[PDB]
């Protein structure tokens, strides 16, 4: 539960760091954002579940 | 103790997201 | 003394009206070209 | 798309004056930075927050904003649960990512213009209706917000009322002053000493009540603009352009910035001295309290004590006859406060209560506030400029008030500047006098 | 032709950083002055001199650091590295404040060299030397304040020490001891500097908002002809503007610009004379008629009398740690103080 | 609009430059650092170390009181220190 | 090895952060050094 | 302080506040890269 | 009559008036005549004012023992604080002159008018087709009068703490300020002196460079000024020769060649610097004062090693301890 929580919360940070540097260069070079429109979509969708994970999971640790 | 570790990365991050664009040359 | 207050008040109203009804009078209009 | 053959680099953002879409990313990306801050700062504050210690002694300015809405606090501003703080902090921090997304999106991928990718959102500056309407939408969003407060106070919990009968405490307002005669009375109040205008609000009923009026009056105007166009004068009076509109909102913020500076500096109610520090006048008052209290214990008759000038070491009279504290503190005789009120009579400070009704909690309140006046240095060294290093402190009331006067000011310059530009832009000469038709040259010599 | 004309030739050669004959004096000094300061600011102390920490090495920040004056014992000694004081020794020199007369005297020559430069470069480029005339003003200030002044006092110790805060005390001192703010010359001084910073601002804005349109852009900066021709702003329009808002207005750029040289240069010249007088302590301290009435009548009070009391406090509370060589001891009971404070 | 000197822009961009200064710059830095950290600077400038303003007991200042026998007087002040 | 190769905009943002770092070290030194008050 | 669990992020949260400033900054990194057009 | 009011508005706004009485002017002209007229009478004949509210009148007018340098118009009483004190608020004028009534009548009308004076510096520029912004340069000196005459008093809780209207009275404002705020040690004031010093500096630079690079058109025994006629087409100085000299004094890229960029800088510098100085006084009006480095550097044992920052504190204490002799009854100066 706890480590399970620190995992979700900690991974959620690295995804953000990655997501943040990503989306930019994404819409940036139109070398796609069609193939990456797939990547970004998964990052975005993923992110939300994660927040919801840490959200609900918070009430069990603290 | 030394969370300067943090700053450092999130710091070279800003310039990175434009540099990679200087490489993939496009949309600056 | 209660008078002076009245007078002063009147006097300041005059000018303040003259001021609002002034810029209201289509001030943008007043200038060299485009209006 | 846009480069130097638009505007100069350092005026870059003006190249977006006519690209609705991108000009939306900006506002959506920016609004992100504010949420980000609000959120990211709260957690910073909480990360350093020490429960058993005054908030004002910790450089806090957001947690105290939450505390006022009745959250995580109880009797006398005692901090009970730090959860509401952590919550409000993280929530914002998250929404910052959501907004930030949209911002970045609308400014580098989505449509560079809107008018075509949807005529509902696309807009025309000179479109007196689209303008009056979008304004109308926002006038409703803000209106709902004003009620979002009225709700938290009447239904969801209350607000921190320092004037609390039993002594400062979270109280549920269930009797908002709705009497227009009173509510709007405040606007007809002098902004000088005593009658303080808006900043003189001193009880939560009026605060809550007044917000009720604003919420409605506000949404009412939101609908009215949705359903209308500027009349005639409204049109022959203003300038209709992208800059001109900005300017008008610039001068508007400036003014609100000055009003805010005075609220946090003077007001006791919506800015509880329990979370922020003691007000400027409140602290000078407390010194008089402290020493009238002390010396009185040493056997001095405060009522008849004569000071160097022959005016009254501890108590003197104000210009209209009321009994007030003496000393340079004669300038703050307009200070009212929970801790000091029980000593006031129908004629001001009552010599009998002062003589035997002073309570210990008041003595230490006066002492606390006396030693926490809003005096400090840039490098945060609490006290008078000649003081010694040791007590690292600068009242939250000082920080807030200064920062906002600066911002308020520069914005008034911003106003003048963008308004001056708009008027020349309109008539059309904001780029120079027509070498050919030089206006001055067609005017008679004043000589 | 000859070694001299060849030496010349080389010097007056148009480089990135023009050297010139003048440079032979300017650069050696100018660099040594700047250098000595930067050195002391971070390394040398003022302990043996003023009982003060004065360098980064001791804990001072950019505001509190400084190259403090020599002891009062030194008197007006030039304090040469190899003179009777330091005796060739360097470290001692440092501790006796040799670095002050070093920065002082060197920078002094550096201002001579620089003005000469202007004069030399002016001549070559074939323009009038009004840039040199103007610079007389700053020389006067430096000369009168960092040299003539302390030369009139007991020693270099009372000259302004090189440093930010160390200069603020020079200000406070002058108020407290010389009641300098009440001096006719200091006033003229400020009228000029204050009035000069006005012409600056006012003229600048008058030009930028009285410009002709020579471009199609909003950023009108590019729209400028580096190569003369027409006036870039309507001198005629400017005249009418001010003539209607202020009542008076220029109308002769040649005069408007000469005026701008005059106002601040004259101001600084006056502020200098005032100080040349403070050297002999020949100050503008009091108004006798005022003092006489204040003596006989205890109910006469002006913002002037008020100030003089502020001075008494400044002198009494500062003198002790500000003039160490005087071994001042002022018992708490002798210290002037109002009520409560 | 020009003189002999090689346009800074070109130099600040030349990989040769950095190849040289990546060495030189930090070089100078580490040197000055050591200048302070080795306590050498304190002796080069007679500047007191945190434990050398006063003697343990004394609370008086080592004020130089006469020009000519100044150096001599200063030396004696160092005497009391330790 | 001359002729611009190290892109300028990078020389700057790098030499730039480099200064905010050293000047920032100074600001930290203000709450710890000798220039402290503790 | 930060709820017991998140404590591991104390340090992280210590720098978050300053980020906004960075953006105003980046806009300059960018223009420099795009040669101030 | 094309319509009286229609006409009136045409006159007021007329750009053919010797002095442009504008719309802002309709408020300016009267307020400024009141401020000026009341001042002149005050300064010459007003009687003593109990500035500190402790019944200790400070006479500051000529006829009552003052000379130009000492004389001043004294601030309203401290007994009054921030309360509005219009003549119709006094049992009599005698009472009004004693509590420093004239001061308010003057500062309020002046500040009012001086603002409109700004509003006017815009209007005329509009009616004349010239770019605005000049009025924005004047926002700095105005924003100062405001800081010194209103913000500081609001902040401090009394008009009696506003800067007096007189020479010496101003030095008083300064000397005390420094004691209570240690302004010389505040970033904003420093930026202020940079702007003022700088201004004067640049004012001299421009002034000389230009005047020194004027094209010859005058005799050897004829005012070099005549070489210019009002309403010229081409320039009167060689801005290329100017730049040529100045570029060599320092070095080329460190010199202006664009008269527009030159003049922007020329205006920008002082105005920006004074803006900060005004924000300084407006900021120290809420007690956020200058840096306090008192007893920072201390030695190995704990002894306090003084810096020039300390010598400054002593001079400040002298001022603190002696100002307002009889006005304090307690330990801390919180007002
Ligand atoms: C025409 C265009 C003009 C453009 C002009 C642009 C001007 C721009 C100005 C920009 C910014 C001004 C910024 C101010 C930042 C203030 C930071 C600060 O206050 O930070 C405060 C901190 C803390 O200071 C520390 O404060 C500390 C302690 O407080 C305390 O801490 C202690 C424990 O640590 C105890 O608890 C104690 O009781 C408690 O009070 C200690 O005393 C330290 O010893 C002390 O050093 O700052 C320090 O250390 C600070 C060392 C500061 C040097 C500061 C210089 C500042 C401004 C210079 C302007 C120069 C202009 C030159 C122009 C030239 C040409 C134009
Ligand atoms: C940015 C600025 C943003 C401003 C934002 C909002 C301002 C809102 C103002 C509402 C004002 C109502 C009012 O104001 O009413 C205003 C009053 C009328 O005042 C009232 O006069 C009243 C009393 O008459 C009576 O009371 C007396 C005893 O008090 C006696 O009994 C007497 O006989 C009896 O008749 C009381 O004294 C009140 O306290 C007093 O406020 O005048 C005045 O405000 C005069 C105000 C002068 C302002 C001068 C400004 C100068 C420079 C400004 C630059 C701005 C930028
Ligand atoms: C270019 C440059 C442009 C420069 C513009 C400079 C400044 C603009 C300032 C605008 C201020 C609007 C202030 C305001 O609404 O301000 C309200 C404040 C507060 O006023 C003070 O309010 C005080 C009382 O608070 C106390 O009393 C209250 C009840 O009365 C409550 O109980 C409260 O909790 C308690 O603490 C007292 O009544 C004081 O006498 C009263 O002066 O404004 C004051 O002081 C105002 C003094 C105002 C002069 C305004 C001229 C406007 C034209
Ligand atoms: C454009 C400008 C460009 C300027 C470029 C400048 C370049 C170099 C400047 C050099 C300056 C040298 C200053 C020398 C000095 O101060 O030298 C000082 C000594 C005199 O020294 C003083 O002597 C004093 C004591 O006199 C007493 O004690 C003495 C015995 O010790 C005798 O008994 C004497 O009679 C008795 O009165 C004290 O000892 C002082 O501490 C000591 O400084 O000689 C002398 O000055 C001889 C002085 C010739 C002085 C020329 C002065 C010019 C302006 C002066 C303004 C004064 C106000
Ligand atoms: C504070 C907010 C802010 C915002 C929202 C904008 C927005 C915009 N600006 Mg400015 N600008 C700013 C501040 C800001 N600016 C400042 C302070 C300056 C002075 C230095 C300028 C100077 C300037 C100029 C000179 C120009 C603009 C232009 C533009 C537009 C550029 C479109 C583009 O080319 O994308 C390019 C974007 C990139 C190459 C990468 C940026 C990625 C950004 C969005 C995010 C970085 C954060 C992070 C990594 C993202 C994580 C998101 C998260 C959800 C995962 C755009 C609408 C241009 C214009 O007006 O065109 C018509 C133009 O010429 N701006
Ligand atoms: C703050 C103001 C704001 C505004 C005015 C707009 C306006 C617009 N957007 Mg965004 N957008 C924003 C913020 C904003 N957006 C943010 C923060 C994000 C990131 C999450 C996005 C992400 C986004 C995307 C990915 C797209 C747009 C698109 C569009 C355009 C759609 C027009 C259309 O064709 O019909 C579409 C009709 C609508 C979009 C309106 C329906 C809105 C619903 C779905 C949500 C309302 C929000 C929320 C759930 C309500 C609160 C509920 C409560 C219970 C809590 C329009 C101009 C689209 C576009 O580029 O079109 C050309 C598109 O593809 N926007
Ligand atoms: C939140 C922003 C907001 C904005 C930007 C606007 C903007 C506008 N509204 Mg509006 N309105 C709003 C909210 C807003 N409203 C709300 C909440 C309501 C509900 C009450 C209304 C109700 C409303 C009505 C009923 C009307 C407008 C009208 C107008 C237009 C008026 C043009 C004008 O001359 O005004 C400038 C105001 C003046 C020139 C009058 C001068 C008044 C003097 C006496 C005092 C000025 C203030 C003083 C100097 C300082 C403050 C003192 C303090 C005591 C208040 C304008 C575009 C008019 C219109 O034509 O609509 C289509 C109209 O008839 N509005
Ligand atoms: C409240 C909203 C607001 C908005 C939306 C705008 C929007 C705009 N303004 Mg503007 N302005 C405002 C308020 C506002 N202003 C205020 C209050 C002032 C008074 C100071 C000004 C003064 C102003 C001027 C003088 C000018 C503009 C201009 C512009 C346009 C500039 C385009 C650009 O590239 O940005 C430019 C942004 C930059 C170059 C970034 C530099 C910012 C510097 C000056 C300050 C940074 C401050 C920060 C706190 C310091 C931290 C430093 C760090 C190292 C620690 C743009 C449309 C320009 C224009 O051409 O308009 C038509 C112009 O010349 N504005
Ligand atoms: C280069 C331009 C120089 C201009 C003036 C140089 C003067 C040099 O003057 C000379 O310095 C050396 C030290 O370096 C001194 O040498 C003296 O100081 C050192 C310390 O520095 C002592 O250890 C030594 O015992 C002592 O005699 C000489 O006594 C002095 O006469
Ligand atoms: C919250 C309170 C709000 C209160 C609002 C009170 C509003 C009171 C009056 C609104 C009056 C509009 O009044 C009308 O304005 C137009 C300009 O637009 C004037 O027209 C005016 O301007 C033109 C130029 O444009 C002049 O040549 C003309 O002589 C002049 O009169 C009308 O003469 C005036 O009657
Ligand atoms: C046209 C002469 N060149 C020139 N250059 C400069 N450069 C600074 C940096 C001093 C503004 N100033 C001037 S006088 C305003 N003139
Ligand atoms: Mn005029 Ca500011 Mn020192 Mn309390 Mn009075
Ligand atoms: Ca932490
Ligand atoms: Cl007094
Ligand atoms: Fe000029």
Tab-separated table of N, CA and C in Angstrom, chain D residues 163-249:
chain	number	residue	atom	x	y	z
D	163	UNK	N	-13.977	38.686	15.793
D	163	UNK	CA	-14.857	39.396	16.708
D	163	UNK	C	-15.777	38.427	17.442
D	164	UNK	N	-15.604	37.139	17.155
D	164	UNK	CA	-16.384	36.077	17.771
D	164	UNK	C	-16.702	36.421	19.217
D	165	UNK	N	-17.996	36.360	19.604
D	165	UNK	CA	-18.472	36.657	20.958
D	165	UNK	C	-17.630	35.979	22.018
D	166	UNK	N	-17.455	34.667	21.885
D	166	UNK	CA	-16.655	33.933	22.849
D	166	UNK	C	-15.160	34.122	22.622
D	167	UNK	N	-14.811	35.004	21.683
D	167	UNK	CA	-13.416	35.245	21.359
D	167	UNK	C	-13.114	34.555	20.039
D	168	UNK	N	-12.425	35.257	19.143
D	168	UNK	CA	-12.080	34.713	17.840
D	168	UNK	C	-12.357	33.231	17.645
D	169	UNK	N	-13.072	32.900	16.571
D	169	UNK	CA	-13.404	31.509	16.290
D	169	UNK	C	-14.166	31.378	14.960
D	170	UNK	N	-14.144	30.179	14.373
D	170	UNK	CA	-14.845	29.919	13.113
D	170	UNK	C	-16.348	30.008	13.378
D	171	UNK	N	-17.039	30.894	12.669
D	171	UNK	CA	-18.468	31.052	12.897
D	171	UNK	C	-19.277	31.036	11.605
D	172	UNK	N	-20.446	30.396	11.661
D	172	UNK	CA	-21.347	30.280	10.515
D	172	UNK	C	-22.263	31.489	10.415
D	173	UNK	N	-22.130	32.252	9.337
D	173	UNK	CA	-22.969	33.429	9.158
D	173	UNK	C	-24.319	33.019	8.609
D	174	UNK	N	-25.351	33.276	9.393
D	174	UNK	CA	-26.696	32.922	8.997
D	174	UNK	C	-27.570	34.147	9.179
D	175	UNK	N	-27.113	35.276	8.641
D	175	UNK	CA	-27.855	36.528	8.762
D	175	UNK	C	-27.151	37.654	8.028
D	176	UNK	N	-26.836	37.432	6.750
D	176	UNK	CA	-26.152	38.433	5.935
D	176	UNK	C	-26.915	39.733	5.777
D	177	UNK	N	-26.228	40.837	6.036
D	177	UNK	CA	-26.827	42.145	5.887
D	177	UNK	C	-27.181	42.278	4.409
D	178	UNK	N	-28.467	42.424	4.115
D	178	UNK	CA	-28.901	42.564	2.733
D	178	UNK	C	-29.480	43.954	2.530
D	179	UNK	N	-29.626	44.678	3.634
D	179	UNK	CA	-30.159	46.035	3.594
D	179	UNK	C	-29.293	46.902	2.677
D	180	UNK	N	-29.802	47.253	1.483
D	180	UNK	CA	-29.002	48.080	0.581
D	180	UNK	C	-28.541	49.364	1.247
D	181	UNK	N	-29.448	50.023	1.966
D	181	UNK	CA	-29.108	51.270	2.652
D	181	UNK	C	-27.754	51.147	3.372
D	182	UNK	N	-27.521	49.996	4.004
D	182	UNK	CA	-26.267	49.737	4.717
D	182	UNK	C	-25.174	49.270	3.768
D	183	UNK	N	-25.403	48.136	3.116
D	183	UNK	CA	-24.433	47.594	2.176
D	183	UNK	C	-23.796	48.714	1.361
D	184	UNK	N	-24.549	49.287	0.427
D	184	UNK	CA	-24.023	50.364	-0.412
D	184	UNK	C	-23.631	51.620	0.376
D	185	UNK	N	-23.992	51.667	1.662
D	185	UNK	CA	-23.658	52.815	2.496
D	185	UNK	C	-22.162	53.030	2.476
D	186	UNK	N	-21.432	51.919	2.571
D	186	UNK	CA	-19.969	51.873	2.551
D	186	UNK	C	-19.353	52.661	1.396
D	187	UNK	N	-19.929	52.554	0.203
D	187	UNK	CA	-19.403	53.285	-0.942
D	187	UNK	C	-19.520	54.798	-0.792
D	188	UNK	N	-20.455	55.265	0.031
D	188	UNK	CA	-20.640	56.708	0.240
D	188	UNK	C	-19.844	57.221	1.445
D	189	UNK	N	-18.999	56.343	1.989
D	189	UNK	CA	-18.165	56.632	3.156
D	189	UNK	C	-16.863	57.325	2.753
D	190	UNK	N	-16.437	58.309	3.542
D	190	UNK	CA	-15.203	59.022	3.247
D	190	UNK	C	-14.041	58.034	3.294
D	191	UNK	N	-12.957	58.328	2.562
D	191	UNK	CA	-11.807	57.426	2.572
D	191	UNK	C	-10.753	57.942	3.535
D	192	UNK	N	-11.102	58.983	4.289
D	192	UNK	CA	-10.170	59.559	5.253
D	192	UNK	C	-10.238	58.948	6.670
D	193	UNK	N	-9.544	59.564	7.621
D	193	UNK	CA	-9.514	59.042	8.976
D	193	UNK	C	-10.883	58.846	9.587
D	194	UNK	N	-11.092	57.721	10.256
D	194	UNK	CA	-12.394	57.469	10.846
D	194	UNK	C	-13.254	56.777	9.813
D	195	UNK	N	-14.046	57.552	9.080
D	195	UNK	CA	-14.887	56.999	8.023
D	195	UNK	C	-13.845	56.456	7.056
D	196	UNK	N	-13.727	55.137	6.924
D	196	UNK	CA	-12.702	54.609	6.034
D	196	UNK	C	-13.087	54.043	4.678
D	197	UNK	N	-14.354	54.176	4.297
D	197	UNK	CA	-14.854	53.651	3.024
D	197	UNK	C	-14.885	52.121	3.096
D	198	UNK	N	-14.711	51.448	1.965
D	198	UNK	CA	-14.748	49.991	1.939
D	198	UNK	C	-13.926	49.318	3.034
D	199	UNK	N	-12.731	49.825	3.303
D	199	UNK	CA	-11.880	49.186	4.292
D	199	UNK	C	-12.421	49.232	5.711
D	200	UNK	N	-13.481	49.995	5.940
D	200	UNK	CA	-14.052	50.070	7.283
D	200	UNK	C	-14.997	48.907	7.617
D	201	UNK	N	-15.171	47.969	6.686
D	201	UNK	CA	-16.034	46.817	6.932
D	201	UNK	C	-15.504	46.187	8.203
D	202	UNK	N	-16.378	45.909	9.164
D	202	UNK	CA	-15.900	45.357	10.425
D	202	UNK	C	-16.669	44.198	11.040
D	203	UNK	N	-17.437	43.467	10.245
D	203	UNK	CA	-18.189	42.326	10.763
D	203	UNK	C	-18.520	41.442	9.580
D	204	UNK	N	-18.582	40.138	9.811
D	204	UNK	CA	-18.813	39.229	8.713
D	204	UNK	C	-20.167	39.306	8.027
D	205	UNK	N	-21.209	39.752	8.731
D	205	UNK	CA	-22.532	39.869	8.105
D	205	UNK	C	-22.482	40.753	6.859
D	206	UNK	N	-21.908	41.941	7.003
D	206	UNK	CA	-21.791	42.869	5.885
D	206	UNK	C	-20.942	42.234	4.775
D	207	UNK	N	-19.815	41.626	5.145
D	207	UNK	CA	-18.949	40.966	4.174
D	207	UNK	C	-19.784	39.971	3.373
D	208	UNK	N	-20.390	39.009	4.071
D	208	UNK	CA	-21.220	37.993	3.422
D	208	UNK	C	-22.398	38.667	2.714
D	209	UNK	N	-23.111	39.521	3.441
D	209	UNK	CA	-24.238	40.219	2.855
D	209	UNK	C	-23.831	40.904	1.567
D	210	UNK	N	-22.845	41.788	1.673
D	210	UNK	CA	-22.359	42.505	0.509
D	210	UNK	C	-22.006	41.606	-0.663
D	211	UNK	N	-21.349	40.475	-0.396
D	211	UNK	CA	-21.005	39.574	-1.485
D	211	UNK	C	-22.259	39.018	-2.157
D	212	UNK	N	-23.330	38.867	-1.377
D	212	UNK	CA	-24.586	38.388	-1.929
D	212	UNK	C	-25.002	39.395	-2.986
D	213	UNK	N	-25.019	40.674	-2.621
D	213	UNK	CA	-25.405	41.714	-3.567
D	213	UNK	C	-24.539	41.739	-4.816
D	214	UNK	N	-23.219	41.631	-4.637
D	214	UNK	CA	-22.302	41.648	-5.779
D	214	UNK	C	-22.562	40.468	-6.724
D	215	UNK	N	-22.689	39.267	-6.158
D	215	UNK	CA	-22.951	38.086	-6.970
D	215	UNK	C	-24.137	38.276	-7.901
D	216	UNK	N	-25.251	38.745	-7.352
D	216	UNK	CA	-26.443	38.982	-8.148
D	216	UNK	C	-26.192	40.155	-9.093
D	217	UNK	N	-26.044	41.363	-8.550
D	217	UNK	CA	-25.770	42.544	-9.376
D	217	UNK	C	-24.790	42.225	-10.504
D	218	UNK	N	-23.814	41.374	-10.215
D	218	UNK	CA	-22.817	40.993	-11.203
D	218	UNK	C	-23.368	40.100	-12.312
D	219	UNK	N	-24.046	39.013	-11.939
D	219	UNK	CA	-24.602	38.114	-12.948
D	219	UNK	C	-25.683	38.827	-13.759
D	220	UNK	N	-26.405	39.739	-13.110
D	220	UNK	CA	-27.456	40.515	-13.762
D	220	UNK	C	-26.841	41.272	-14.929
D	221	UNK	N	-25.690	41.893	-14.685
D	221	UNK	CA	-25.002	42.628	-15.730
D	221	UNK	C	-24.407	41.674	-16.755
D	222	UNK	N	-24.167	40.428	-16.344
D	222	UNK	CA	-23.623	39.433	-17.256
D	222	UNK	C	-24.643	39.094	-18.324
D	223	UNK	N	-25.900	38.972	-17.917
D	223	UNK	CA	-26.985	38.659	-18.837
D	223	UNK	C	-27.243	39.881	-19.710
D	224	UNK	N	-27.391	41.042	-19.069
D	224	UNK	CA	-27.642	42.297	-19.772
D	224	UNK	C	-26.687	42.556	-20.937
D	225	UNK	N	-25.404	42.236	-20.766
D	225	UNK	CA	-24.421	42.454	-21.835
D	225	UNK	C	-24.525	41.381	-22.922
D	226	UNK	N	-24.924	40.183	-22.494
D	226	UNK	CA	-25.125	39.050	-23.388
D	226	UNK	C	-26.224	39.477	-24.347
D	227	UNK	N	-27.263	40.064	-23.765
D	227	UNK	CA	-28.428	40.523	-24.493
D	227	UNK	C	-28.382	41.980	-24.958
D	228	UNK	N	-27.211	42.509	-25.315
D	228	UNK	CA	-27.166	43.899	-25.775
D	228	UNK	C	-25.913	44.350	-26.521
D	229	UNK	N	-25.922	45.641	-26.859
D	229	UNK	CA	-24.843	46.339	-27.557
D	229	UNK	C	-24.668	47.705	-26.874
D	230	UNK	N	-23.446	48.247	-26.887
D	230	UNK	CA	-23.286	49.556	-26.246
D	230	UNK	C	-24.243	50.559	-26.893
D	231	UNK	N	-24.828	51.438	-26.080
D	231	UNK	CA	-25.751	52.457	-26.579
D	231	UNK	C	-25.043	53.404	-27.539
D	232	UNK	N	-25.413	54.682	-27.500
D	232	UNK	CA	-24.808	55.658	-28.392
D	232	UNK	C	-23.580	56.330	-27.816
D	233	UNK	N	-23.752	57.011	-26.686
D	233	UNK	CA	-22.646	57.678	-26.014
D	233	UNK	C	-21.589	56.630	-25.714
D	234	UNK	N	-22.023	55.516	-25.130
D	234	UNK	CA	-21.107	54.429	-24.813
D	234	UNK	C	-20.192	54.174	-26.007
D	235	UNK	N	-20.667	54.496	-27.206
D	235	UNK	CA	-19.859	54.283	-28.399
D	235	UNK	C	-19.086	55.532	-28.834
D	236	UNK	N	-19.720	56.705	-28.754
D	236	UNK	CA	-19.072	57.959	-29.137
D	236	UNK	C	-18.123	58.451	-28.047
D	237	UNK	N	-18.015	57.674	-26.971
D	237	UNK	CA	-17.154	58.026	-25.848
D	237	UNK	C	-15.861	57.215	-25.806
D	238	UNK	N	-15.984	55.898	-25.916
D	238	UNK	CA	-14.825	55.012	-25.863
D	238	UNK	C	-14.117	54.785	-27.182
D	239	UNK	N	-12.967	54.122	-27.085
D	239	UNK	CA	-12.148	53.751	-28.234
D	239	UNK	C	-12.345	52.247	-28.354
D	240	UNK	N	-12.634	51.764	-29.559
D	240	UNK	CA	-12.872	50.344	-29.732
D	240	UNK	C	-11.738	49.655	-30.462
D	241	UNK	N	-10.834	49.072	-29.678
D	241	UNK	CA	-9.661	48.386	-30.205
D	241	UNK	C	-9.064	47.414	-29.195
D	242	UNK	N	-8.183	46.552	-29.686
D	242	UNK	CA	-7.565	45.556	-28.830
D	242	UNK	C	-6.768	46.133	-27.686
D	243	UNK	N	-6.065	47.226	-27.957
D	243	UNK	CA	-5.261	47.875	-26.935
D	243	UNK	C	-6.181	48.626	-25.994
D	244	UNK	N	-6.976	49.531	-26.548
D	244	UNK	CA	-7.913	50.311	-25.749
D	244	UNK	C	-8.630	49.463	-24.690
D	245	UNK	N	-9.103	48.273	-25.064
D	245	UNK	CA	-9.791	47.430	-24.085
D	245	UNK	C	-8.826	47.032	-22.971
D	246	UNK	N	-7.623	46.624	-23.362
D	246	UNK	CA	-6.598	46.247	-22.400
D	246	UNK	C	-6.484	47.383	-21.403
D	247	UNK	N	-6.026	48.535	-21.890
D	247	UNK	CA	-5.847	49.723	-21.062
D	247	UNK	C	-6.937	49.851	-19.997
D	248	UNK	N	-8.198	49.893	-20.430
D	248	UNK	CA	-9.310	50.024	-19.495
D	248	UNK	C	-9.228	49.003	-18.351
D	249	UNK	N	-8.835	47.768	-18.665
D	249	UNK	CA	-8.712	46.739	-17.630
D	249	UNK	C	-7.421	46.941	-16.822
